[PDB]
Homo-oligomer: A and B are copies of this chain.
Amino acid sequence: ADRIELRGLTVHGRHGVYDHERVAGQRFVIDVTVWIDLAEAANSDDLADTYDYVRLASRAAEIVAGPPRKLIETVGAEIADHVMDDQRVHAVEVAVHKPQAPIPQTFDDVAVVIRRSR
């Protein structure tokens, strides 16, 4: 099927298991992939016939910026829940990246990806 892909949505947040993570918070990066039939929207060229990526980005960002979760799993589940509330969506993958996570090791990124589908 077709898909809408949002990549690199960068939002300051305070999610974290440990107290020290919630004093000042850190950078979070969100990807969203939405599986949805896009044929109708190419016929109508009407935004109402697709899933608006402007609303998706603002909603995703507000969740990330909101009151902190312990787990990024829970942040990703809240974003995925939002996407599936649109009955046209077949499936969604939400990647919550925590690239500044406190890990004593040298690494590029750590993330969870929450998948949902009908």
Contact = CB atoms under 8 A, between A and B. Distances in A.
Contacts of A9: 105-108
B47 A5 contact: no
Q: Give the copy number.
A: 8
Interface in A44-60: 45-47, 50, 53-54, 57-58
A69 B53 contact: no
Interface residues of A, number: 60
A66 interface: no
Given A11-B106, A24-B102, A103-B54, A42 B77 contact: yes
Interface of A: 1-12, 17-21, 23-27, 38-39, 41-42, 45-47, 50, 53-54, 57-58, 61, 69-71, 73-74, 76-78, 95, 100-115
